[model samples]
Target: TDIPYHTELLSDMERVIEDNEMAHIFSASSSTGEVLYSPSVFHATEKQKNAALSLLEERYKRDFPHDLAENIVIRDIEFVDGNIPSMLDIFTRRSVLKLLGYSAWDEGLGKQIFFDVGEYRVNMFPLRIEEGFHLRQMVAYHLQEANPRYLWLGTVRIQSVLIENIGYATN
Candidate 1:
């Protein structure tokens, strides 16, 4: 006799959770996921990387029209599981920017990235200036759609416009 569909699904779900936990244990780490700084750690295939890069470029151009950066350079990419704490939560904008290497003195310094939250896209930096006094302010965006309950695909850190002569050019 066949097992009940609901029971079978429940068992499968338990197995998946167990396997995930075991994987974390074996790695001697938690399920927060890894930061892929190089092409070697990139678990995704070349095709997927290409697709993500294209999407990233499009998103960057669409979001920051005033920026004169020639092209986006991915410094690193992070893939976080649902278990990882959301960046917009708990952490202050100042701390987040600091963590991302932004400093008060650097001109044109800030992070500009997009969050693909399944249902919609989120622009990380919406204001003209995201430094100095703005750093003190908390993130005003609503993260309802980006709740930890939902799955997160990954995060890409493009080389930010640090100084004027660096990657950023005045327009």
Candidate 2:
């Protein structure tokens, strides 16, 4: 049963690591018995990409704990901007709002629209920007929760988000 539960994402992670010479593997707990290990690959510049790959390869080969390789749950793959763009139209522009709608907390922004990764309710604002295109002013909240907050330093590109919706096997 343990083997069945862990093998799903483990193979995906292995393929991702094999295809991409370098990777960022993050492990975290879900406040329950669940464990998630995300393997992401980002390439910004040749220098940064090479450096990251080199380090991750070293870790993958020498720093990893092989004994616990199959305990992971979610395997997140990602790609990000190597350099912060001075002018990002996507965030400053009121586009995501058209789909995500306004939050219950804030009385602004409009959406016809939607919420979270794949669901919707009244309004859930997970992003904001008072500084225009600056990354520091940008903020977001967990759409699934009930409050105002800052999104973590990282964000997933909508196109890159993965959904493993099939029922798991325990046999």
Candidate 3:
């Protein structure tokens, strides 16, 4: 079974490599698994674009598939360290209390409307800052930022956060 299941992205030309076991190809897409940015994601700077492509090619070659199913077409090429912008929004402005009618949560911002992605309920505070925090990070931080007890970092990027094992509970 030949396959493709890993990649890097930039603005054009997808560099696909055969899995070690040869069973899949990697490409670009949204969190919903939609191929929004195929070949590579669009970037303004050539540096960023080239970096993405180079990374994809290296990763694709580095990790080939361990198992394959013999002659089946690998329709799904997966991107490693892949993520999508959250459907939810977090705020950090006065509108949290006035326009949207939310006035609490220790000064949390309000959303024009509320949305939940994966499992996080986002407010307006972070979104207002235009921090680009994804839902994964939002939910992960919400758990830590609970009860006004843990707020130490000065300024971290929203997109930089990735929740760890939030759903992988064991008994």
C-alpha local distance difference test of each model: 0.30, 0.27, 0.23
Candidate 2 has what TM-score? 0.21
Candidate 1 is scored at a TM of: 0.25
lDDT of 1 by residue, 18-93 (tens): 5544222212122132333221121233333333444444433433434453554333322223232244432333
Give me the overall lDDT of model 2: 0.27
Higher-ranked by TM-score: 1 or 2: 1
TM-score of each: 0.25, 0.21, 0.19
Q: Which ten residues in a row have the lowest lDDT in candidate 3?
A: 21-30
> What's the best-to-worst order under TM-score?
1, 2, 3
- Write down the RMSD of all candidates, one decimal each: 17.5, 17.1, 19.1
lDDT of 3 by residue, 2-35 (tens): 4322112211122221222111111111112212
Error of 3 at 169 (Å): 17
lDDT of 2 by residue, 23-65 (tens): 3221111111111121211112333223333432332333234
